Design a protein around this ligand. Structure first.
Ligand code: 9D0
Ligand code: 9D0
Lengths: 208, 208
């Protein structure tokens, strides 16, 4: 898998060179490239942002600079991912589906986002996905791209989860559930499913 | 605000020293400390993980090492945050509420998570929150803590969003909507609300 990430903050993708992602990249499974969006600008001040049409707060990322960067990095086979608070929610099924892709391109935005015509122009030649990592507001899309790449890379390398325990059996007056010390595989699996259904009902009832 | 993050991978929190978070930290608003969990171990091999009771895949983070680290860093006023796939979903309202906290402690887990008795023992003296950033699986909680800190720090420093546009008015045969060039504040706001309702219905109908 070839992964390209375009951003005004390349240093923010540095966690992808460590731990699980780092291993996958070093072992030739993944070819990861981080690019500074300013390398495609032609002006003296390397500007990437301009004032929005119709007024509004902040700045908007210019379509011609994104258009040059994507023209160079993308092909007809590329899946262009645009992290955005207005996208569809990223899920485990999306992470699983993206392991089947040959080339993923993450266009990380800052300011108030990227001019909408970049994605419309990209959609004429390649598949585009506008994706949110959740119902909260981030300063940019770099940390969302890290999250998305980590979910995809761990699937390449290889109800809510219930509680887990390890030694000691008693710690600060707190005992490991007696069932986990039974040796009985069947009642262990039954208890884990039971506490997993219970935690799901309390914390995420939408999942049952 | 004082923020402490405990992890076996301190380098994975390096994006918090750049951009928006970096500014907030440097300007004395936020006091950020990253700690290596191995600094509280006493064994020769600095082990943080052990085999799970009741069998299962992988390893579980030991309660005594987490117990020592939290005993030193936390007080009765501390809000202990445990990033976990089994937690409640992180939202904008949570990010807003956490700006009111004096001391936030993020206990980042690796392997299959942290022994459950750590949070039960912590809940005897401090407020604890078990939080997920979304319905996808990550290799650990460092990138989820980055996401959570970035959402909180941007609120300190200061329906789905509709499309945005900037110069030029025509780019690759794609024109900026005529309404955004009208000068008419009222029909601009009406059009933006309209395209925002439309995008919400298509991509996130659960929000209306
Ligand atoms: C005083 C300055 C003006 C501030 C006005 C802020 C109003 C909100 N503008 C919308 C906006 C918010 C955040 C972003 C950056 N977010 C991401 O790139 C992002 C990418 S994926 C994602 N997932 C969840 N939430 C997210 O914010 C994101 C882009 C546009
Ligand atoms: C062959 C090795 C065995 C693999 C078995 C994996 C089965 C799943 N175990 C549960 C588990 C998954 C991920 C984690 C690490 N995740 C986070 O720390 C995390 C912290 S916040 C969060 N939000 C969404 N998703 C997340 O995964 C997280 C911890 C326990």
């Amino acid at each position: 898998m070839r992964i390209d990430i375009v951003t005004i903050f390349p240093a923010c993708l540095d966690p992808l060179r460590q731990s699980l992602p780092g291993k996958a990249i070093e072992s030739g499974l993944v070819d990861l490239n981080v690019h500074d969006l300013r390398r495609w600008t032609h002006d003296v001040h390397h500007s990437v942002d301009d004032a929005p049409y119709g007024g509004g707060p902040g700045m908007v990322m210019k379509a011609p600079v994104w258009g040059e960067a994507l023209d160079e990095i993308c092909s007809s086979e590329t899946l262009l991912i645009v992290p955005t608070p207005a996208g569809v929610l990223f899920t485990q099924a999306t992470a699983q589906r993206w392991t089947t892709e040959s080339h993923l391109v993450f266009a990380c935005g800052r300011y108030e986002g990227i001019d909408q015509r970049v994605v419309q122009d990209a959609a004429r030649r390649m598949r585009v996905e506008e994706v949110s990592i959740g119902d909260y507001v981030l300063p940019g899309g770099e940390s969302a791209a890290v999250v998305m790449v980590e979910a995809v890379l761990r699937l390449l390398a290889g109800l809510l989860e219930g509680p887990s325990y390890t030694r000691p059996a008693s710690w600060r007056g707190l005992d490991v559930p007696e069932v986990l010390l039974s040796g009985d595989h069947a009642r262990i699996a039954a208890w884990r499913r039971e506490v997993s259904l219970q935690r799901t009902r309390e914390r995420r009832p939408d999942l049952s």
